[PDB]
Design a protein around this ligand. Structure first.
Ligand code: 9Z9
Ligand code: CLR
Ligand code: CLR
Ligand code: A1CG9
Length: 409
């Protein structure tokens, strides 16, 4: 129902936008009031960011076992790091080169580490740290507004690891944040019931307020940038990584995952596609069962190739829309924030939307600019999930080749 409701809201929002745009002259004040239901939806999404990322980040980390630290688990983590790193570079290169929404670096990277360790946990919920050179030059910090997602994610990772390893002493903390994570999921579900009506006025409000259709061509280039990045990752990069490690034709392996790929094109969830991925990887591709049960669940949470090519590209596209010429330091900040946002909004309905709201809030871009992403979020998220499933499927074969000796004992 979520897909049809979101699609209908976009269709109805466009229909409402063009009818109100022509059949009625609206002043600047009335246009702002017309988008109030959409504005209220954005407030709910920002409201749930803080409890969602904190509880989800603690809950996922606190349940980690010793298998992740094993040789099989370490190889999977290294593989997902390398493919995500390639996807991060590929997404940055494409959005910088194509420049879809268009017409110091040391301090930006140092600010990334500074925000990675906030000076106050409560302030990190609504403030971020920035440094600017002053005049022979000195550095001055400001602590501007904006939720510090990187600081919260880092602390919740360390906090989750600590409470996971202290056994029954920290079991109450694991239980507390498990229930809090479940409660936040239900509240997100309640918000998604209002999302279609909010999307209708967000889309219609955006159609009314625009004066020229040049932004639509910019949206078309944004689709090309996201689709081009996924196409290169799925057809060029991932098959090449598979072949060099396994020395076997990756297209027969991809053909074996055909049923899992189609299931990804409808369910649009890597976790929900796991049962199909497990069967296709195990019997069709003859990948060992002992390794699929480890690599695939690991990829269901830390496979950020799709996020790098979809959410980070979208965030940079929004930055280019606001006439912001961000540099290498700022672009890297967006990409790292996007992956941190994704791990925070993992098992969430409309994760693509929720992740985008987290990234825009944590970067400074207007979260109301996400309406252009929403109009195609249903389409682009389906392909993003398909690439993530293909990436996880290739990982099982890649990890298996490197684990031949371990599987022999
Ligand atoms: C469904 O269950 C899944 C489970 C296994 C899951 O294990 C994973 C849990 C998350 C965890 C700890 C894992 C690997 C990379 C970890 C990330 C490295 C990234 O580094 C950072 C910081 C530095 C940045 C450059 C990039 O991002 C962090 C935000 C990111 C990070 C700390 C987020 C948490 C990730 C292991 C299956 O087990 C059977
Ligand atoms: C250089 C940049 C990318 C930061 C590098 C940080 C890497 C090396 C760190 C960040 C958090 C760490 C992970 C956090 C927790 C666990 C659970 C543990 O039971 C097995 C290892 C594992 C999975 C860690 C492996 C190393 C890790 C991924
Ligand atoms: C560089 C960024 C990503 C932060 C990573 C910081 C690393 C150094 C931190 C993150 C979480 C930390 C772990 C969290 C909890 C424990 C349990 C403790 O009884 C032994 C050490 C151990 C396993 C920590 C080692 C250091 C650790 C891995
Ligand atoms: C799997 C892994 C292990 C160790 C360090 C990083 C990663 N993976 C990863 C993540 C990520 C995973 C979850 C949230 O973020 N983001 C990035 C970026 Br940007 C660039 C490069 C890698 N990356």
């Amino acid at each position: 129902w979520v897909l049809l409701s979101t699609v209908a809201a976009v269709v109805l929002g466009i229909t409402t936008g063009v009818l109100v745009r022509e059949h009625s002259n609206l002043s600047t004040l009335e246009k702002f009031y017309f988008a109030f239901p959409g504005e209220i939806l954005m407030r709910m999404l920002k409201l749930i960011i803080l409890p969602l990322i904190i509880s989800s980040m603690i809950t996922g980390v606190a349940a980690l076992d010793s298998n992740v630290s094993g040789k099989i688990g370490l190889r999977a983590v290294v593989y997902y790091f390398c493919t995500t790193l390639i996807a991060v570079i590929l997404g940055i290169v494409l959005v910088v080169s194509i420049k879809p929404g268009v017409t110091s670096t040391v301090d930006a990277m140092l600010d990334l580490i500074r925000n990675m360790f906030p000076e106050n946990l409560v302030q990190a919920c609504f403030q971020q740290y920035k440094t600017k050179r002053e005049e022979e030059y000195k550095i001055v910090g400001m602590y501007s507004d904006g939720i510090n997602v990187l600081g919260l994610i880092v602390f919740c990772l360390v906090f989750g690891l600590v409470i996971g390893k202290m056994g029954e002493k920290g079991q109450i903390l694991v239980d507390f944040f498990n229930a809090l994570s479940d409660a936040t999921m239900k509240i997100v579900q309640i918000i998604m019931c209002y999302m279609p009506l909010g999307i209708l006025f967000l889309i219609a409000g955006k159609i009314i307020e625009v004066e020229d259709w040049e932004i639509f061509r910019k949206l078309g280039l944004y689709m090309a940038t996201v689709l081009t990045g996924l196409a290169i990752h799925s057809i060029v990069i991932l098959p090449l990584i598979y072949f060099i490690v396994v020395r076997k034709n990756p297209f027969r392996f991809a053909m074996g995952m055909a049923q899992a790929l189609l299931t990804a094109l409808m369910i649009s969830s890597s976790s929900a596609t796991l049962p199909v991925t497990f069967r296709c990887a195990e019997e069709n591709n003859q990948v060992d069962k002992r390794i699929t049960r480890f690599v695939l669940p690991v990829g269901a949470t830390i496979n950020m190739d799709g996020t790098a090519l979809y959410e980070a590209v979208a965030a940079v596209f929004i930055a280019q829309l606001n006439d912001l010429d961000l540099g290498i330091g700022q672009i890297i900040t967006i990409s790292i924030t996007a992956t941190s946002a994704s791990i925070g909004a993992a098992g969430v309905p409309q994760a693509g939307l929720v992740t985008m709201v987290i990234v825009l809030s944590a970067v400074g871009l207007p979260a109301e600019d996400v309406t252009l992403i929403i109009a195609v979020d249903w389409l682009l998220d389906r392909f993003r999930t398909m690439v993530n499933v293909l990436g996880d499927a290739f990982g099982t074969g890649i990890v298996e080749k490197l684990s031949k000796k371990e599987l022999e004992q």
